[PDB]
Write a protein that binds this DNA or RNA. Structure first.
Length: 95
DNA sequence: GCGCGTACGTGCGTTTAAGCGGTGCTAGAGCTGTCTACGACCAATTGAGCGGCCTTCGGCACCGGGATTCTGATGGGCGGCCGCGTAT
């Protein structure tokens, strides 16, 4: 049949996590995927840009790390890094 | 439109610090050179994800049955009708 994949499974549990027996319209659901896919290119594209400025050829986590910092304002940014840094840190701990 | 008020432009003198070209020093960019770890690629197996399809309980707002309260015809008894009516 057709494809047209989306992030619907990811957005839904997140909302469950923050009000479990709280609801949503089928119109705000796409707004959400539209919103995510939009932020996706915003961050990953910028990573691509720096990589081939100061003369290197792969994109790691550090770059995102840097990228994120100047893409967003002071207070959210730090918490965001923190969360980000740990999630992965744990990831490696396992293996 | 008009009129009041005052603040901001234009000037001079005083004053303060940029810009100039002079030297010295070393830090940090840029180059360079070897290793090897981590990502792309190709393979084969496996279940997360998408289309397709129809689920069940709880909550908003309309509802249900039974005792109880208020309105209506009924009725004997004390009074009043003054006006037609029979008896001597």
């Amino acid at each position: 049949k057709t494809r047209k994949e989306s992030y619907a499974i990811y957005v839904y549990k997140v909302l469950k996590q923050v009000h479990p027996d709280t609801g949503i319209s089928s119109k705000a659901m796409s707004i959400m995927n539209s919103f995510v896919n939009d932020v996706f290119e915003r961050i990953a594209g910028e990573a691509s840009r720096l990589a081939h400025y100061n003369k290197r050829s792969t994109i790691t986590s550090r770059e995102i790390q840097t990228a994120v910092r100047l893409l967003l304002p002071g207070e959210l940014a730090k918490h965001a890094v923190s969360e980000g840094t740990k999630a992965v840190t744990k990831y490696t701990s396992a293996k």
